[PDB]
Amino acid sequence: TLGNDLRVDGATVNITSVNLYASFFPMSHNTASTLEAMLRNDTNDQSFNDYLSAANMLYPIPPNATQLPIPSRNWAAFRGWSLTRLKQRETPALGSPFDPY
Amino acid sequence: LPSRPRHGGIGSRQFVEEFVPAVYLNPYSGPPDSYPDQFIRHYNVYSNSVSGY
Amino acid sequence: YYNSGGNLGVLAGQSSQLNAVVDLQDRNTELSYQMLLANTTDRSRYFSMWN
Amino acid sequence: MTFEMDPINEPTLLYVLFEVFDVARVHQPHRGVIEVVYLRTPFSAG
């Protein structure tokens, strides 16, 4: 609830074991093989789309005034903007495994 | 000559001669029994079904 | 580790060791999943299988 | 884009996400080989 850092407070986490579980639907072998053969075809490929399909760009803001982003490109099939303000202290640096700051 | 004319499997030469790549134009359209079977690796024609472990 | 750098997960099959997972560091899959849950399910009800 | 916003003392950072078409297509031809194609049309990836 408080914005304290836990590295200084000395919390730490120890992982004992990691296991992967999966659930298999027990569908008949003949029907499952038929479905596998049908889905292995190049015309029946599965398609997925990221829900927040966007390019996230975070532009730092000095604690006043305005700002101006972005150079050139082709903007084909663009779908829109979604601006929001974030505090730099709260936002980490996901581009690295560890954020010392 | 052999006593019987060796009925059975197919050699590599005849296999590559005859089992040419197949072009399946409209893929898997119709009733399940109309599908091209034997595209499945584990499938026997006799008693049509998929052989498991 | 989602959309990270060196810590990239792989789903590559044993065939060609070609990873089926690519991350761009410009995509926010955590926020995408949060929005997906908030739009599909009534998130006001707490669930314990996942937090 | 020129953004004007109320000033706050703490250093902050803007969160602009350009809505694109992030889509992936998965092809599984033969028993354990998986080929996946990605496409991001406004902001190309590869």
């Binding site: 029907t31 789309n49 990221d50 829900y51 399909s53 | 009733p31 399940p32 | 997906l36 739009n39 | 809505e19």
Partner: peptide, 30 residues
């Protein structure tokens, strides 16, 4: 077969779903 053997039979007619029901589109940034 007809693929009606894979669906629940509400009496005699199968409880088939819509022909165009397959497919989905759920994507918005906000």
């Amino acid at each position: 077969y007809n693929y009606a053997a894979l669906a629940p039979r509400q009496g005699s007619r199968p409880m088939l779903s819509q022909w165009s029901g397959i497919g989905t589109h759920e994507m918005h940034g906000g």
